[PDB]
Design a protein around this nucleic acid. Sequence first.
RNA 1: GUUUACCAAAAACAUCACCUCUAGCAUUACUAGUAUUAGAGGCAAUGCCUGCCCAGUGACACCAGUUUAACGGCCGCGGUAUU
RNA 2: AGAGUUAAAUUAUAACUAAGCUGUAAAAAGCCCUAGUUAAAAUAAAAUAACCCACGAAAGUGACUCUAAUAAUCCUGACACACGAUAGCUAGGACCCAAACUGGGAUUAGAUACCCCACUAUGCCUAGCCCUAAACCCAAAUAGUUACAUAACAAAACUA
Lengths: 122, 72, 175
Amino acid sequence: PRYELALILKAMQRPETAAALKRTLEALMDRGAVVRNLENLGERMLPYKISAHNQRHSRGGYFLVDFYAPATTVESMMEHLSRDIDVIRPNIVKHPLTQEVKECEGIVPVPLEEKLYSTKKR
Amino acid sequence: KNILKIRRRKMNHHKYRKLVKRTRFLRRKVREGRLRQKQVKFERDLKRIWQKAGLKEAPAGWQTPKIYLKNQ
Amino acid sequence: QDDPPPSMLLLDYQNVPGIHKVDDVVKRLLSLEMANQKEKLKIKKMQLMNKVLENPEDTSSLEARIVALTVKIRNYEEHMQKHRKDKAHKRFLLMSIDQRKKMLKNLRETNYAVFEKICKELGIEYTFPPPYHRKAHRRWVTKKALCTQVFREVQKLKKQKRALRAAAVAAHKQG
RNA sequence: GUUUACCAAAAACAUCACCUCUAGCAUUACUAGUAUUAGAGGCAAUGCCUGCCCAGUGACACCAGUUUAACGGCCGCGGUAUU
RNA sequence: AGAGUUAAAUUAUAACUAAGCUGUAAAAAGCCCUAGUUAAAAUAAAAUAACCCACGAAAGUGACUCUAAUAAUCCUGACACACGAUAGCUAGGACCCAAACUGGGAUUAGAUACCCCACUAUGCCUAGCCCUAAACCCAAAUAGUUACAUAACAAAACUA
Ligand SMILES: [Mg+2]
Ligand SMILES: [Mg+2]
Ligand SMILES: [Mg+2]
Ligand SMILES: [Mg+2]
Ligand SMILES: [Mg+2]
Ligand SMILES: [Mg+2]
Ligand SMILES: [Mg+2]
Ligand SMILES: [Mg+2]
Ligand SMILES: [Mg+2]
Ligand SMILES: [Mg+2]
Ligand SMILES: [Mg+2]
Ligand SMILES: [Mg+2]
Ligand SMILES: [Mg+2]
Ligand SMILES: [Mg+2]
Ligand SMILES: [Mg+2]
Ligand SMILES: [Mg+2]
Ligand SMILES: [Mg+2]
Ligand SMILES: [Mg+2]
Ligand SMILES: [Mg+2]
Ligand SMILES: [Mg+2]
Ligand SMILES: [Mg+2]
Ligand SMILES: [Mg+2]
Ligand SMILES: [Mg+2]
Ligand SMILES: [Mg+2]
Ligand SMILES: [Mg+2]
Ligand SMILES: [Mg+2]
Ligand SMILES: [Mg+2]
Ligand SMILES: [Mg+2]
């Protein structure tokens, strides 16, 4: 996976959520991006009341879409998602799996700094 | 210590700024007068070139534009 | 300007066996369409080094360094058009140009035959450093223009006087 | 550039520029236009600027309050450093 | 360097309650179209993380996401070229909050200051200038040594 969209859809019914996901994925595909996987994180309570599309949203469904897209179509998809009234807060980031985990060596014992002052007698 | 020299320079700069503020327009008149003479000297220096080159008149298509009296 | 196709099959997956037999999805994923600017820079660098240089393995050579800096200079110029206010990138481009010019001077001093071919293939016009680097102010520019015009008028008048004298002597020698 | 044809052609008017106010709109002006617009005005390109005041009279506000690039105004008395 | 987004606070804006609110060592002035709670756009800035010491040549940079991207197979080197904190200028826009100046209220013999209140340029965005700082880490750059050796203080003395 290259890019990861953390879609926050408005809390709605099952057919409406399915239609919104279908049209969002079709919009993603129209831009020249193949979709790897879609994972539903469940409908949770929002940490804060997000105000979007002149509506106060207290709940929302979380979805995660990982895909491969060209670097030029990220903002176009962001613009398309910004005008969708069924999306609370869309965000496209780099997929964490792209960055390989580095060797966490651990704490290295750093000695106290010496020779910071001259040896003149006080 | 060095604060004495710093304060002396500060006082000199403050007095110079006050003098400039008090005599601003006289300084502007002097600057304009000196720029006038600068432009005249440049014009005469340019004239002397073709005077000593043998030409009796300035080359055709030559205007000698002002370079020191330009507006802000 | 070079036009790398979006399906160029970048070099990281270009030299591996069994790459043309894979399906269009994997080919598109491994192609330049899904790649960033760094992969296109690598493709342009290899394409230029294969066609301009004679020994692509020798990277430490001056001709290799010049063509390596050429793609970076072109990328910086491409970025500058989109980012007019990017002072850091402008400084990077200007210093890369100076480094390339210094390497071109060294290459011209060392091997002239390679220098000429590099310049002809890259389109770079090497200009000798003008002595007495000065800031041409208005007074100097005006005086230089006046002197040039005066010299041209004086030589034109002298040529006309010479023609008139030649005509007069030709007329007088006949009768 | 214009003006007192017929005693006055200008230091007068206008003028580009700079400032104000008045107007969210359709079949005759403005205008077959729509605030970067259109009218009622002041002063005059450009350069430096345009300092204080709503106490009075106006104008918005239908009373307070705001306005001077609105009408307009921006001080006395007495002694003092060595004459 | 561009494009997109906002968690806390505040405010234009409405409703209920109440009379003061703000203000300082103490007061006065100011607002009572005031104060508290509940909802609330736009602008500005970016708590803890940071006991971290990274990036960039320096200035400078630490709310989040995306794109581009951080020269030199690496010596020194200008009056040449390109940058250059805040402040100021020009044209257009925004203006919660802070604030030069200013006007009031305190204190003082005087206070055109420190203290409180209101407000302007300005700090905010685009483009174009201006090119100055205790631009200081007051310690030039490049490769080194701990030999001789404490004017004083301070960041120890030194080589090519
Ligand atoms: Mg002095
Ligand atoms: Mg006339
Ligand atoms: Mg007439
Ligand atoms: Mg008459
Ligand atoms: Mg007449
Ligand atoms: Mg006349
Ligand atoms: Mg007459
Ligand atoms: Mg007149
Ligand atoms: Mg003006
Ligand atoms: Mg005038
Ligand atoms: Mg006035
Ligand atoms: Mg009044
Ligand atoms: Mg009044
Ligand atoms: Mg910007
Ligand atoms: Mg507002
Ligand atoms: Mg009171
Ligand atoms: Mg923050
Ligand atoms: Mg580097
Ligand atoms: Mg150098
Ligand atoms: Mg500024
Ligand atoms: Mg302001
Ligand atoms: Mg304030
Ligand atoms: Mg006061
Ligand atoms: Mg600057
Ligand atoms: Mg500093
Ligand atoms: Mg110094
Ligand atoms: Mg140096
Ligand atoms: Mg001692």
